[model samples]
Target chain A: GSLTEDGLSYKEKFVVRSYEVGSNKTATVETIANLLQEVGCNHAQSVGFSTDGFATTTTMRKLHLIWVTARMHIEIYKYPAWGDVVEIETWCQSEGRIGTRRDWILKDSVTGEVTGRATSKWVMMNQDTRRLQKVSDDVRDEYLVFCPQEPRLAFPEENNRSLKKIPKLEDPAQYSMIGLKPRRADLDMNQHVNNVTYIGWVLESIPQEIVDTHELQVITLDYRRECQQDDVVDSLTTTTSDSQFLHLLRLSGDGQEINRGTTLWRKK
Target chain B: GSLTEDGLSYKEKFVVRSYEVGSNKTATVETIANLLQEVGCNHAQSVGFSTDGFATTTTMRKLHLIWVTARMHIEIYKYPAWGDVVEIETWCQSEGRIGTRRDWILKDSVTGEVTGRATSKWVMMNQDTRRLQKVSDDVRDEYLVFCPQEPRLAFPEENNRSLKKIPKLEDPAQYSMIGLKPRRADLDMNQHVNNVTYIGWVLESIPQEIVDTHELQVITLDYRRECQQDDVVDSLTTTTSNDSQFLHLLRLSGDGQEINRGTTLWRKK
Candidate 1:
């Protein structure tokens, strides 16, 4: 890992490992999200922002705070096959009063052609109280020196806003898969389900015909609440258009929303 | 990937990725198993043994045949943490008249201390017929040049024989978990369940008390038959001793055997 763009952006190269690919013989979307998380954490560590774990700054760790993903948007132009090397560039910017935005550009190591892009908005939560926390000045001072002055987004503002308006699929919509529980392996160091695991559940409810006929072009996720290992989830999806699908994951016991997602697909 | 041991062994370097780790901040057994599979495939590819997909040879592909695991044994001396670099060395040898044995040695790139070792037995099967097929002379000639003249194993021959005799778990086992189905992502390029997925399920059935207080030292798996995505599996385990457990995976319907495993654990310091 190294800092580029005059110490504003971090770059890392990764080889798509054998196990990361899916039946298509290419890296899955979940693989892309995991790589982004890896580079982002390494970037935090490269600077002095991470001392404990999971990209937590010393100030945040002392305050018993941890960053959580609130929203994510990823657009894939091509999926790299196994044995392909990918270079990812990532940087963080201030989102609002309490949130921060991180953006990444994915490129082919040899051709230097852009393969995909992703951006996520993160907010801090008190690890003990499980309540939203504000970005204190101490935390800001520790990481702001490495961030750019202005905001940067991989997706345009208009598209981000429009994509955020994912209508919650009502009960008994089009398609549903129930009793989806988190495996022990699904839990990350945070002791909760990883954000990328939700992406896999979202795609699981789609019909196999669609999976074989098309490839995902873009995906947008809005994380609502933390999912525990004991929580039983039900994934629901509805066809908004021939090429677009909206999905929701809710608890089975009380039907509490855990996440909402929208995806765009194109013919392979 | 490079050839070592005078073109008899294949070696590769891999950096543990973040997602491959678990809550202990170390790589999981499933991760170790996957790496072994990767190195084995790369070794086959390096010697012009892979053509269509997976580790299938050109002649095997033409005959509609694929290699399937019959048995596996792994011993983990230490689990590497995330971001640690590991060097893996693998080689294949003939097993009897119809099967091939592959062994691997894992080491830390910096210290060169052995982290783990694994050995597996694979047999050819007709993919279309779903039946075991003998390794014909055509397939033997294609890969025999890379094999050693004498048999080599990571584990002693006596231990291998004793570990192979995993008893069948009876009905109403002490601990059991049902409705363990394979996810779409679990299906590998072979279109059946990946062998590593079975390892996760084998551990999933163990009580959380054992999971929290102990670390796995060794694992042995005996593959019986293939599992499909629609198959509902039941993972059953019985404690034979304080630090040892015997596991059985069977299909919920008709009670067909899927796999048998034995795991040895040691308390964390």
Candidate 2:
């Protein structure tokens, strides 16, 4: 990854691997999410914002803090097929006083066409205390220099407003899949389940018919809490409409919510 | 990827991705297996052995046949860390009248040191009938030009001999994990569960203590059957002794062996 010509964004290129594709021979949404995470992490290192050899801001690392994703939104206009090259440009910005935002623009390297756009909000937590903390001036200054002066949003304000209002999926959902456990491979360097894996669990409860005949067009997730290796989750889904879904992930034993999501789909 | 200067072996380069690493910041064994599968498929395509745009042999695809892996063995002296560049060189040769053998030599791109080696055996199957088939002369000659004249073995004859004789685990495995189902993402373009996922299932049954304090050094799997998406699996592990184990994967409904395996000559961290 390298700094962009404008010197405000970071850019990286990736070739979709064979294993990244599904039955349709195109990259899965989970794979796309993974690529975005990879580029975002590398960008932190490229800009000297990350230390300790992990994907944490330099100030956060110094203060024994970690970044946890609080929300994410992705809209895919087209999916890249196997062996295709994808170029991603990502930049970070301030989000109020407690969190920060990152946005990505995905392109088809050969055609130079916009394929997807994604945005995420992340908050810092004291690694030892396990409590969220507001960004200090030092922490904010660590990354403010790299962000664009003008506000940049991957999603228009109108779309962002609607995404922010995703209604909570109530209990007694139409469909539910229980006994979902984290496989050892799902754990990241932080020893917590990666947020991308949560997206997979969210889709697991979708109707088989929907999964068979529909392609995901948009997804927004509100992450409520972190998932540990020992956590047992139940994925629940509600059919809001023929092409829309609301999903929830909750602790099977305690009935505590872990994540909430909404999705838009199109006929295959 | 390109044909080596000798126009015999095939070479490809890959960068270990961030998501491919486990908690140790090194690439997981499953990730390594996936990489080997990728390079092998690309080599087949580069050599004109694959014409269907998939990893199947040209003649096999024309005959409505596909290659199914029968056995595989891997030895990793060192696991590459995240973002490390790995160069893999792979070549194939006829195993017998019925199967073919492929071998890979993995190197650290910058250090040029051999990090790992793998060998696998594959047999042809009629996709429509789901039955194994003997390689006809015409099928054998379809890509004979790409095969090396000399028989190459990634592992010495002695190691291979012992690897072939891995004792089967008896009933009442010490550790068992059941109710395993393939996620939608686990299926490949072939619509079958990818073989690399089976490796992850095998390791799932290992003791947590072993997983925490040790690292896998060698693994050998013997494939008995292909797994469908709807299949429910049971992964069982038998501890032969410290640092080694015998593993098995079976269909939970019928108790049928889906894949027989043995693995883990692990080293202490």
Candidate 3:
């Protein structure tokens, strides 16, 4: 992550390297998630009340607190192709007592054209207790200023109408990838599957034509539970009448939902 | 991958990212391998002889040509911590009509100090025959100059003496990670474990202190065979005495060998 400028609206520059792209020769959705995560952490380091100084990752870890991602509403104006330089801008502000809100917009560095945008909700988790911790005064006290206090979705119209709930499909054996096992590589420092990997899976479920031909307008994902290595997962998608798509992933052994997401695509 | 000043040598710069690092927060050996692979591909695309103007991956696919990595001799000076930018230099030359020789050296871009180096051997496989093919005149015609041809190992002395043969250990279950299933995520575009992933498993076997403390002076690997999804593997390390170590990986189910190697050079703080 290379920081180019700073403000309540922080921004950074990233090159879509070969490793960051998929076989389609375009940047993976996971790469966007990584850039967003970087900017979010940059924002945390900048806007925080560190007793000593600079609330960096090293400093925050001493307090036994870590910021965890809760949910995201992301949109892709267009997926950047390989070798494309991308600029990622992100800013975060308080969202009530228990949550912090962050948003990101990515643009092509070469053309200065917007390529992607995402808004997310986050809450600090007590690493020791593994429970959501309130965005206490000390936490809020860290920020210099929480700009963009007024909530705005990346794609408001797409999100304005309630997204259709993805129903439990009787037999989703045919849609695409299903009964998937989380590989050893999928696990991060923590035992849970890396959140970014789920984003990759979402792309995997979509038809190649959808990825190649359509511009993703908006997507919202709700992570319901922590998925483990042994847990087999079922990915299912439903076509809504309003030209939108809904996807759900759940544990195959038990019917517990893992993640539910909705994507809106405009034919390019 | 970006090219730098090189004839046979191809070079590129890469920034170590958080996802590529292990729990120790340092770039994993696999990360370095991936960078190496990138530069190697860049070298291939630039220096090639095909009926087409310049050989692209598309060009090779048309002729059913694939470069398969056979062996590696890698050494590390220091693992770059996450977020640090590093530059990679790779050069590939002919190695006897049947093989290709490639080497790489990584440096800290800011400091201009060498971080790591590797030398490897590759054989072109005819995808149609699924067998090693001879490097013809056309292959030789590809390289602008098979240079730095007067080869020098990254660490001349360590790699000079040669790595020991890791003996097959009899009936051992208490090794590092093995016998796990390769999930869909593990497979690459062509449906095989990404070569770099093996480097991760190699480091996974060593003790944490060795990983955290050692500078990993030099290491070598011979990929005896390709691993199948269902094949159960055992990551075994042979007992060693000096500043060196040896490792072997074999299928637990069939007794066929997979990877043979050595790793980690210690430096007392």
Candidate 4:
């Protein structure tokens, strides 16, 4: 079975679906992974792929998935915190000889609110060859029991994208005023800077002047690429107004962008 | 002033010392760095250089005096633990014409037991040229009150002239049957695996068969080298009849050597 824009789909006769919420204030990545592991995928066959967009939800998903797949190759759901509730609903949408499609809905559990939803494409591949293969009849039939009503989450509008000119730095001095130096401990096993460490750097790079005057209410970031050792990152910050600020963090090598991120900060 | 087996020779002064036990069980490299920073050294300059050779206390003292500048550094008297006391004492032994030698003793506050002691050599260098210059006598005289009688403790007597060769795998098939895979989460900021994560791997690598029958009572490890990204390390374990096991884990380089070594104890589970 797989997730699709129209909901969940499957081949032959099976439908598999699942949902979860944060009844507690916090949910661990292991718990989420175990939940998904119970449904099907084991420790070795799962891989987590995520885009750099979707600030809060995407990070939440990526963090939990990485932890789960580390121990067991299983795809897990990313449950948001109390204030950031994300309600997820899944359904099998189709049946085919090759594989199936499934649809998902991310909503606010408290107010029955609709937040954002997605349809993911999945194929049942041969475990050994990792080649697309037909689903077994037994597995297909077992999934049908969990099929729920057609999901109501609206599909995101599709638009063909084209490369646009990179935005120029509006206020370089704002960021240049804040300086950061990488330490030996920041280096990871890769011998280069770790990606997560950059996040910490960006967080630390916020000038004390700004932090002392304003409360950081929310932040969203998009990670465009990776960084290597010896790469010096230029942190750019701009205050759009008294309450809103934008930060552009970029790593350059020989005058080329290697990794870049834009973070939106709101004053509390 | 240099720290020699004879004792702190040049000058000595004392400074206010503080102690704290780590509240968190999981120790962080940053936390360690911060602790070092609080004592005066900042950033990389404060990082201690480590080598894989063992020397007797007397030899270490001589080597320290000759090779290391008499700057304040730290010694690990005992490994800091959660809710366990960590005492820090700082003193300048002597102020010379050029530089000053400083010493630190970290002890357990509750038992008043010294866990580790360290001696460091710091040279007063010109900030712009990075040139060393002699410490003035006036400056040395002003900071001399902190000096206290140096405490004596038993130091390591065994001298390890050379590191032992990594033992070859016996019954390779038995060891090969177990599977060990790196996790993506194990990857750290450097994109390379984190050093601490290796300890977690060593912890996980314990044979399930052994753990199923015995309780893990103690673990002691010495980190000898670093493993870079994508470096596949082979973990080899040697067990004695009494349920004590020695593990020599290493990566296969042309010149093979143990990257880490550990001893583990097991009691009937």
Candidate 5:
């Protein structure tokens, strides 16, 4: 039915250009992450979360209430290639405590076939202290009024996935990347590494055969800690099964896992 | 005044987003670099280049018509931060010897002040051979007919600074990145590492002190060879002169340099 009238749905159109795509003529995972971030943030504001607007909207503390990504699960049914116009549909509602749950689906505009879907858990953080804030009564009331109440995108066990488990991991060099040094360009206005950059690192560990024969149909991530510009991270992955892969990002200094997730795949 | 009336004037608008900005809240050099690239590539098509549209646009044989950057000179009077809107006006015209001279100026729409200016030289490259091509009669005719004759962004003796002298450089152990291997993610649809990534590597070579006390104003890059995935290249920078000046290079195998470049000036607050 109507996700907009029946629920909260925000739709956007994007045309993937030559610059946005990877060597395979498909869009880079980084770009996809970028688009999804754009959609999610835009949707939050559209639902009265207060991103304000551009031009003079630069540094208002009012715009700093961020729905910090606690966990995200994504699936890539088909990687949209260059010049492919992708329509993304996103919606959000309450999760629990101070948390909000959001979901997004990307569909090919030309074919009208669904290309991907993502479900994520978020918590509001006080942008000043970087501490998780309790969901205020007024903000909770706003979500109750605008959100669809019944959710379209769902986890198999209703957000019961073991994403928060940070497992110990080792990285093998030679065949693997030692560490990705977060460049100055990687830091955002918050002076922290942007979340999309972490997702991109997760994709970097999968072998090419995995990328060629299979689509990243489902993947999950839990952000354990924040990374800044001076830090270096190592992306490591181990196959849980022939079709499932787990990717972990760890700090090189202490080997502390910053993010860990598993991607379920379908034959391309 | 009539920059577009006489020739090709392509206009684009961009609002710097939260993800695109740096720690200073200003747009990162790489993001600005990416925007300039999009505007440039789009303008190439607006004037009858083969870019055409986004579809059939992926690795099309039609992409043989490319404007390869031979040299680039960019000056940043100000950096636009996230949520800042910028208006980019770009155009192209003949530069002789099958070359095209292109220029771009970015203005902060909120204040209507000029924020950045860039002048670049491009030559037709045969996609197959990766070699420079002479602009034939039709290509030249297309430019003369649609491009504006009067140019707004120009380099006097200013943008004419030298970037070609490839001095031997050593990337010291403590301060610089030895070699950055291009990841599969780094490769573009064209199957070679993107030019913006190379620009990013150049920044990685500079130390934090320079980053703290100086802002990159005008920088120049001369592309000598194309780098592909599986290639590990070293970014070596050397102090040029005066305490704050430097030059950087991305190298081939031992001492063979693929790029010879330097920043024009530094303005740090």
Candidate 6:
């Protein structure tokens, strides 16, 4: 009796356009939220979302809103080729008593091939009690019809257990030092460190010798905590013989981890 | 006898093929200096050697062995029509005892119309004392052949005026407030505020409401002073009832002034 193919009565589509200066150029998750806003979508009405977890896409400021939930799950899949345009598609699937299930797809637009995909389980919470609350029945019925039934792949596990240990350089060549200073332009509205500003600091930490010798092939980042306005952070880099390089950037005050990233560079 | 046109031998040429994104889409003077450095020209060989006490160009940053100058003398005889590709050609005419003479031409690549042209005078300086010095004879002879006889237009007199008093606001409604905070991305290798970054700050100060209502038509900037790193600056904007707007920005210290005067028009989106 239902004429809809995906088992949904209504669907919403949005697009975002953005421009960046140099080699690292791609639309961010924030752009999508902005596009949604441009279409008159209320911030409160939007529920449940997911992403491919690319360093640049995952760490964007817009995604921070949903990341506060306990057991927040994010997934990333391997990208096989080069010169691929990053693409992410998000849609609200179902609103439930517990929360909402949103589906996401991140693909290489040039090839129309899916690079990675993910789904998130989100629950509404009371601001006063800081506890989860059941979704309204009307909202649940509206989204349940569009919910996807296919099971998702499990989140990838990290094999590099050494990452948890403090990195120490035995040989001078094994250790890399990157110098950075907080400038006035790095401050944001919160009067604290802007999320996007950290990306530039991380890239700047890459030694000129490395930039001159090799082209950055891929980068993946995981943001653990927020950095305060006046906190000074330093980046330390170490490269393994297997061509894997891990970078740990920490705020100087409490040595609190700001971001942990791993990158693969290939000789140009 | 040399057979080359103007009897000048082609010494060297520099080519830069990167987009220079500043406050606007137009190429900036700093981009021109970068091209000059790419051709192996040093700042010690470039400074103030303007003619008639009206230098067509002004040198803004002069650090140890590094210098940056801006050329705003060339007036736009006619705007490059839409869909026209802009091509810039620059060359050194001569290296004198005090400064070198460099010429530039902005052309419409498709029709080859000379849209803009300028000449600059540069002076060699003692790197240690920051004083001018005579240029070497070999450097003079190397550039003499490219020298053209046509004299450059005098620099604009409007910019030399002092800002002892802030310009009165004509139509307060035209200007909108742009709340901004400084960020670390604006700093440079010198550990000071980079000269080029100021342009972006001025542009960002434009209220999004005004930008959404009006389409930016033209922008003209005069670099009056330097802004250092760690300085907090505020943006002041004024607009006329006719839709023309002006923005004046300065740091909290009030020592230097950064002025960007221009006009804009709105188009139906």
Best by lDDT: 2
Q: How far does residue A202 in candidate 1 sit from its true spot (Å)? A: 0.5
Q: DockQ of all candidates, in order?
A: 0.62, 0.69, 0.26, 0.03, 0.52, 0.05
TM-score of candidate 2 against the unseen true structure: 0.95
Candidate 4, residues A121-142, lDDT tens digits: the string is 3445433343454545554554
Under CAPRI classification, how is model 4 graded? incorrect
Error of 6 at A73 (Å): 20
Candidate 3 residue spans exceeding 4 A from truth: A1-6, A42-63, A144-146, A149-153, A158-193, A201-219, A227-257, A262-268, B1-8, B43-63, B144-146, B158-173, B176-193, B201-219, B227-246, B250-269
Interface RMSD of each: 1.6, 1.2, 3.8, 17.9, 2.0, 11.6
For each candidate, give its TM-score against the true structure.
Answer: 0.95, 0.95, 0.78, 0.31, 0.79, 0.39
Give stretches of model 5 more than 4 Å off.
A1-11, A44-67, A78-85, A107-114, A124-175, A266-268, B1-7, B51-67, B110-112, B124-153, B156-175, B212-214, B238-244, B252-258
Steric collisions counted per model: 0, 0, 2, 53, 6, 13
Cα miss at B178, model 4 (Å)?
35
Q: What ranges in model 6 sit over 4 Å off?
A: A1-198, A201-219, A222-268, B1-67, B70-86, B92-103, B111-146, B149-195, B209-218, B240-247, B252-269
TM-score leader? 1
lDDT for each residue of candidate 3 in B5-94, tens digit (9 for 90 to 100): 655466777777656665555676676887887676566655553322223244355677777777777777788876688888877666
Higher-scoring candidate on TM-score, 4 or 5: 5
Candidate 2 displacement at residue A69 in angstroms:
0.3
DockQ, candidate no. 3: 0.26
Task: Report RMSD for candidate 3.
Answer: 5.0
> Which run of 10 residues does model 1 chain B get worst, by summed lDDT?
B260-269
Q: lDDT rank, highest first?
A: 2, 1, 5, 3, 6, 4
Worst 10 residues of 4 chain A by lDDT: A65-74
Whole-model Cα lDDT per candidate? 0.81, 0.82, 0.63, 0.38, 0.68, 0.40
- Residues B1-269, candidate 6, lDDT per residue (tens digit)? 01124432222222221123122223344443333322222211232232111122222223333223332223344433211345555555443465565555556666777665544445555445656556556545544434544543323346531211334334332443232333333433223344445545555556655544554433444444445433445455555433444544433434323433323233332
Docking class of 2: medium
Off by over 4 Å in 4: A1-184, A187-196, A203-245, A248-268, B1-30, B39-78, B82-84, B109-112, B126-131, B149-269
Residue by residue across B1-269, what tens digits does model 1's lDDT show? 88885888899998887777877778888889999998987787778764356577668788888788888888888889888999999999976557888999999999999998999988988888879978888888887888887767777666453256777776677787666767666777546788898888877777877777788887887878767777777777777664555555554544655555554445453
* Cα misplacement distance, residue A125 of candidate 2 (Å): 1.4
| lDDT of candidate 5 over A32-81, digit per residue (tens) | 77888777666655554544322111222454555678887776768887
B51: Cα error in model 2, Å: 6.8
